[PDB]
Amino acid sequence: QLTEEQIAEFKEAFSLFDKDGDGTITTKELGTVMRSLGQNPTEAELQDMINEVDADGNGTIDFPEFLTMMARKMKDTDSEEEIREAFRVFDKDGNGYISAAELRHVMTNLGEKLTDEEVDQMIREADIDGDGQVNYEEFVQMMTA
Amino acid sequence: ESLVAARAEKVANLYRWLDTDNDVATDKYVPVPGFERVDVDVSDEVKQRMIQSMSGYIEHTDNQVPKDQAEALATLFVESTLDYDWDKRVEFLTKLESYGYSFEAPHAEKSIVSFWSGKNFKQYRDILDNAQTDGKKVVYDIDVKGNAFAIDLNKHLMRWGGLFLDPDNAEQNQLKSSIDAATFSNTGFWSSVYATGAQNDVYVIAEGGVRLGNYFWNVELPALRQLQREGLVGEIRLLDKPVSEYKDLPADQIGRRLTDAGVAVKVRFDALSHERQAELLADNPDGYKADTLVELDVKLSAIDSMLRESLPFYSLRTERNLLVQEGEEGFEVRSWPGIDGKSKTILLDNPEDAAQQKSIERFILANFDNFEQMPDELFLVDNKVLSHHDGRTRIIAQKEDGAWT
Ligand SMILES: [Ca+2]
Ligand SMILES: [Ca+2]
Ligand SMILES: [Ca+2]
Ligand SMILES: [Ca+2]
Numbered sequence: 001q002l003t004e005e006q007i008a009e010f011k012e013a014f015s016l017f018d019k020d021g022d023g024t025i026t027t028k029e030l031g032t033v034m035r036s037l038g039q040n041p042t043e044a045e046l047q048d049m050i051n052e053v054d055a056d057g058n059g060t061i062d063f064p065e066f067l068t069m070m071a072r073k074m075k076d077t078d079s080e081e082e083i084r085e086a087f088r089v090f091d092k093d094g095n096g097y098i099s100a101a102e103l104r105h106v107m108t109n110l111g112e113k114l115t116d117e118e119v120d121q122m123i124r125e126a127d128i129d130g131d132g133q134v135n136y137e138e139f140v141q142m143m144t145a
Numbered sequence: 146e147s148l149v150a151a152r153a154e155k156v157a158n159l160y161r162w163l164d165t166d167n168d169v170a171t172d173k174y175v176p177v178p179g180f181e182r183v184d185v186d187v188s189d190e191v192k193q194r195m196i197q198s199m200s201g202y203i204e205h206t207d208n209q210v211p212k213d214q215a216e217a218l219a220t221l222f223v224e225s226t227l228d229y230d231w232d233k234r235v236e237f238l239t240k241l242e243s244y245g246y247s248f249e250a251p252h253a254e255k256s257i258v259s260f261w262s263g264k265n266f267k268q269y270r271d272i273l274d275n276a277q278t279d280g281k282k283v284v285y286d287i288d289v290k291g292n293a294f295a296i297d298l299n300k301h302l303m304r305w306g307g308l309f310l311d312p313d314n315a316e317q318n319q320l321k322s323s324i325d326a327a328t329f330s331n332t333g334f335w336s337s338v339y340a341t342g343a344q345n346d347v348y349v350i351a352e353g354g355v356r357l358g359n360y361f362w363n364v365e366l367p368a369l370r371q372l373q374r375e376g377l378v379g380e381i382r383l384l385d386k387p388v389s390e391y392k393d394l395p396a397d398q399i400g401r402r403l404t405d406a407g408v409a410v411k412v413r414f415d416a417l418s419h420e421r422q423a424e425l426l427a428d429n430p431d432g433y434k435a436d437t438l439v440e441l442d443v444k445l446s447a448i449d450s451m452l453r454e455s456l457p458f459y460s461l462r463t464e465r466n467l468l469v470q471e472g473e474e475g476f477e478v479r480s481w482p483g484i485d486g487k488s489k490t491i492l493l494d495n496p497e498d499a500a501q502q503k504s505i506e507r508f509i510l511a512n513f514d515n516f517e518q519m520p521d522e523l524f525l526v527d528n529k530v531l532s533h534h535d536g537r538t539r540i541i542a543q544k545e546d547g548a549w550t
Contacts, residue, residue: 022329036506038454079447083450085447086448092416109362112449115482121164143452
């Protein structure tokens with residue numbers, strides 16, 4: 001299922017995290033490595049994944065093992081949709097357009113390490129019209145660029 | 146100077162910022178987020194009845210208000226409340242302070258200002274009390290006298306509404322609606338007030354994850370966030386797991402980030418897509434009621450993920466607490482939010498190359514826990530990573546992959 005572009009990226013990321021040059025990371029570094037490649041499992045999914053791959057009990061993950069677990073992950077998730085869904089929750093009347101102030105509340109709350117400026121401009125180009133209303137479909141397709 | 150007016154202004158700045166889009170703030174009226182304002186004109190007819198009841202409460206309750214002010218304070222309360230006077234409710238709090246009501250957490254520097262928007266608060270309070278090794282004791286909003294006494298007067302108004310206006314009379318119900326909304330925003334304002342007392346790392350008790358629109362979402366977290374981007378608050382530790390899964394654990398990692406994936410999101414059926422509420426009659430017509438909480442299959446973490454992609458080196462902020470930003474001769478690494486003087490440097494051959502930014506981002510991820518661990522100067526040149534602290538070393542060699550020394 002995995003392309004040449006991906007395995008090579010995974011390979012680079014993996015090898016930086018394997019620090020003793022033997023070609024294995026530990027159990028606890030997995031989620032870190034994965035999240036650095038744009039795949040965030042739950043604590044649960046990251047236990048299932050860990051208990052399966054660590055059936056021998058040596059807390060060892062090959063690149064091959066890593067390649068396997070990352071293939072299964074990505075089969076499952078749709079990033080693009082999952083964000084658009086998340087913004088939908090804030091459309092009380094449907095119609096695809098949530099308020100510009102609401103969008104300020106979302107981002108300041110879910111913007112874990114954002115800053116007031118970084119927020120402020122988000123809202124500015126959130127929607128370039130003088131209306132409160134902001135397109136949330138537009139917003140993601142803008143940030144996904 | 147009063148401490149409360151200190152945090153009150155903080156709170157006001159926050160509120161004004163959130164109002165930049167809606168621009169309803171008339172700087173004699175500062176709006177509380179998610180609390181609608183409901184003015185009602187029943188003149189001084191009703192006002193003097195109310196104030197005298199409130200006056201009587203204060204006077205005939207055992208409290209730290211001197212009884213000369215029994216009615217002066219009663220006036221200031223109902224007046225700050227019903228008229229949504231920012232200035233007057235700050236004064237009210239200041240007057241409480243002046244009587245010996247602290248709006249400060251009780252246990253000085255050992256106070257872990259914590260927040261509890263939950264059901265089985267009983268069990269959590271002490272699993273957290275118990276896990277504290279430092280001699281530091283968790284405190285909640287109920288634990289601070291000034292906030293407590295403020296809510297007490299605020300309840301009296303509420304009761305007076307239910308007890309002196311019965312809502313069958315049409316204009317009578319309108320004053321009660323006003324009272325409710327007015328007294329409700331007091332509790333909102335006072336909540337932000339309490340949140341600004343947050344320092345270092347904070348626990349949020351929130352069994353079953355996040356509830357969109359709750360006092361946390363509206364008036365607690367945004368204050369905590371502002372406190373965070375001023376470098377005053379560290380981690381916000383949400384406890385959504387059943388209290389069972391926080392035993393055999395240190396204070397270190399009790400609670401996780403609401404941004405962390407597999408955090409529950411729930412919303413009230415009341416005003417949760419009212420026409421779509423009806424649509425949600427399919428499984429059970431009388432399954433979802435106004436007060437019912439609906440769990441949602443959305444991921445707040447998906448928002449934080451998006452952020453990572455939009456903002457260069459964002460992922461270093463969250464997982465490492467490193468703000469690197471576009472520099473002059475290279476990249477500047479600071480400890481987030483990059484407010485303290487200290488800074489180190491990052492230099493790449495082609496800084497505009499997104500591929501090379503990820504290499505050193507991953508690099509840093511794998512090598513350094515914090516800002517204090519990093520060499521003063523770090524270089525990515527010709528697929529080798531070099532570090533100058535006080536001598537010079539090279540440690541990255543990318544022959545299709547990363548080997549060290
Ligand atoms: Ca190894
Ligand atoms: Ca193994
Ligand atoms: Ca809408
Ligand atoms: Ca717009």
